[PDB]
């Protein structure tokens, strides 16, 4: 009786989601570390297409972080 | 009421060119119209256009 | 396919005459032979006036029958062994035979009854794209105008860049086939960045086209912009020397040679089909714009003048403005006690107001038309 | 009917489950014209799909 109310939130999400007119001007911008317990219904062609990840960053990047708090 | 401007038509005349008109009765239409005139001018023009030059070479 | 050139070539034949009897009648019949055509012998036969050897359209109907009859036969096949994007297959190649046998009515039914099948979108698309085709070889018009929408929708819906380029050259060749150039400019002169649709014609001949087009109906600055300036002319408008040395010249003030190869293009085009009568309006118009583009820069200027620079005597010259300044399609006037012309600019009111006039009584017109047939 | 709860009349459609979980699968709708490089697997998929429903007489 809690999870009943998330799922529809996630078909709410789901209807509005892909219910636009491809000319609806409006992007989803969705931030997740576990990028791993969503339901693949969220990762599809049209709901959420571009898939970016964030590395822990290494040498160079790390130089532009210094460089950039320092 | 169609055979009523049959009728109508029939009063008005017979006749001899609309009925040869008739007879021959098509195509298209394009798209808009005015004024055709004559032809072969362009050219001709040229073809005097050198001439004209050709006189004016003459000249 | 069928092939345009057939078509094209006939219309040669056609021409003013000319007979000749030449190149293009047995290459027409040649490709009757390796055709087996026949819905034209009896077409043309009865159009050019000359038909003979009644055995070869008997030999030719005798094939024909012989694969429509195996088509057929596969069809039925296929019937017990469907076989769904087969059997609208087998299809398009029956009503695709009629267009080798070029019979219009027949591809037509056998295309439509296609598509309650080919459900795909190559086949409902690409296949209509051949229905209009016929149009395009027969000469027709509505017969595309309403395909076109349908292909329209269809792309609209979903597919890809790639279809709706072949489209524009489709559409565009055909406003060049009416007056309507203006539409074909956009159209055709967008067309050179792509052009798989060799179908129709080559290259150089498209690129003849666009240019032609482009020079009519687009302004100085956007003709040096999308014309002069055509990476994919350069290459290619160095291929040809003809329409391109017209081009040239206007846009360059070497008018007096620009008419001479303005002449010659024209000799060019009553042999096309696009243009067919149209040879006589585009030569008017290229007129025009000459002179338009000469007074633009003078408040007067003198006939000599003007005459010499394009190379004619005064009289002609003078009977030549006649044509175009009482239509209001130049702003010139002329005086000729001495020999003078000044040109009075229009206002953009005067432009509209004879356009708009015009538009309103044709839409008046065809209104109360109609009126009176819904009214009774 | 509100108060009276019995049925006023009743409105158009349902909008199906089945449908519904296919909506929210969302897998692509692809048309063959397609997938080139894909037909004897095809062939074999219309010989034990396409002709045994076709024709499950065959």
């Known amino acids: 009786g809690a999870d009943r109310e998330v799922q529809r939130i996630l078909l709410e999400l ?8 491809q000319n609806v001007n409006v992007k989803v911008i969705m931030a997740t ?4 317990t969503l339901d693949p219904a969220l990762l599809r062609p049209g709901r959420l297409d571009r898939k970016i990840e964030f590395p822990l960053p290494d040498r160079r990047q790390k130089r532009l972080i210094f460089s950039t708090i320092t | 009421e169609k055979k009523q401007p049959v009728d109508l038509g029939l009063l008005e005349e017979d006749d001899e060119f609309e009925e040869f008109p008739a007879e021959d009765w ?4 394009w798209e808009d119209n005015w004024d055709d005139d004559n032809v072969e001018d362009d050219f001709s023009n040229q073809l005097r256009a050198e001439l004209e030059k050709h006189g004016y070479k003459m000249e | 396919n069928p092939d345009l050139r057939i078509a094209q070539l006939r219309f040669l034949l056609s021409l003013p005459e000319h007979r000749g009897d030449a190149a293009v009648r047995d ?3 040649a490709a009757v032979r390796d055709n087996n055509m026949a819905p034209y012998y009896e077409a043309l036969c009865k159009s050019l006036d000359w038909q003979i050897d009644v055995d070869l359209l008997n030999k030719m109907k005798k094939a024909n ?4 009859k195996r088509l057929d036969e596969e069809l039925e096949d296929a019937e017990k062994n469907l076989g769904e994007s087969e059997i609208r297959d087998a299809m398009m190649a029956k009503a695709e035979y009629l267009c080798r046998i070029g019979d219009k ?6 295309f439509r009854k296609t598509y309650d099948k080919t459900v795909a979108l190559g086949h409902r698309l690409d296949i209509v794209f051949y229905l209009l085709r016929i149009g395009l070889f027969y000469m027709d018009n509505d017969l595309i105008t309403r395909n076109t929408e349908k292909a329209k929708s269809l792309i609209e819906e979903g597919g890809d860049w790639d279809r709706r380029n072949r489209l524009k050259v489709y559409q565009g060749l055909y406003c060049v086939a009416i007056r309507d150039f203006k539409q074909a400019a956009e159209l055709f002169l967008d067309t050179v960045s792509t052009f798989t649709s060799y179908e129709l014609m080559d290259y150089k001949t498209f690129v003849t086209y666009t240019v032609y087009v482009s020079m009519i109906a687009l302004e100085r600055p956007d003709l040096r912009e999308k014309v002069i300036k055509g990476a994919e002319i350069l290459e290619v408008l160095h291929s040809l020397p003809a329409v391109r040395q017209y081009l040239f010249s206007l846009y360059e003030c070497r008018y007096s040679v620009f008419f001479q190869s303005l002449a010659v293009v024209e000799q060019e085009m009553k042999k096309d089909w696009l243009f067919a009568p149209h040879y006589r309006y585009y030569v008017r118009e290229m007129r025009i714009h000459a002179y338009s583009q000469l007074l633009e820069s003078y408040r007067s200027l003198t006939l000599g003048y003007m005459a010499e620079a394009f190379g004619v005597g005064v009289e002609f010259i003078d009977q030549e403005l006649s044509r175009f300044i009482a239509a209001g399609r130049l702003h010139c006037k002329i005086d000729k006690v001495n020999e003078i012309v000044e040109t009075n600019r229009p206002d953009s009111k005067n432009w509209q107001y004879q356009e708009t006039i015009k538009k309103g009584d044709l839409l008046l017109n065809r209104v109360q038309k109609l009126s009176r047939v819904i009214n009774m | 009917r509100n108060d009276s709860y019995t049925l006023h009349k009743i409105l158009p459609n349902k909008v199906d489950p089945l449908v519904s979980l296919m909506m929210v699968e969302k897998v692509p709708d692809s048309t063959y014209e397609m997938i080139g490089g894909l037909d004897k697997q095809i062939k074999e998929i219309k010989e034990v799909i396409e002709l045994p429903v076709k024709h499950p007489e065959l």
Not at chain 3, 65 to 68: A, G, I, P, T, V
Not at chain 3, 105 to 110: D, N, P, Q, R
């Open chain 1, 14 to 21: 789901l209807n509005q989601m892909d219910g636009f007119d």
């Open chain 3, 27 to 29: 290459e027409l019949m």
């Open chain 2, 26 to 29: 098509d195509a298209h239409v």
């Open chain 3, 105 to 110: 009515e027949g591809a037509l039914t056998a």
């Open chain 1, 33 to 36: 570390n576990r990028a791993d």
């Open chain 3, 65 to 68: 029958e012989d694969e429509l």
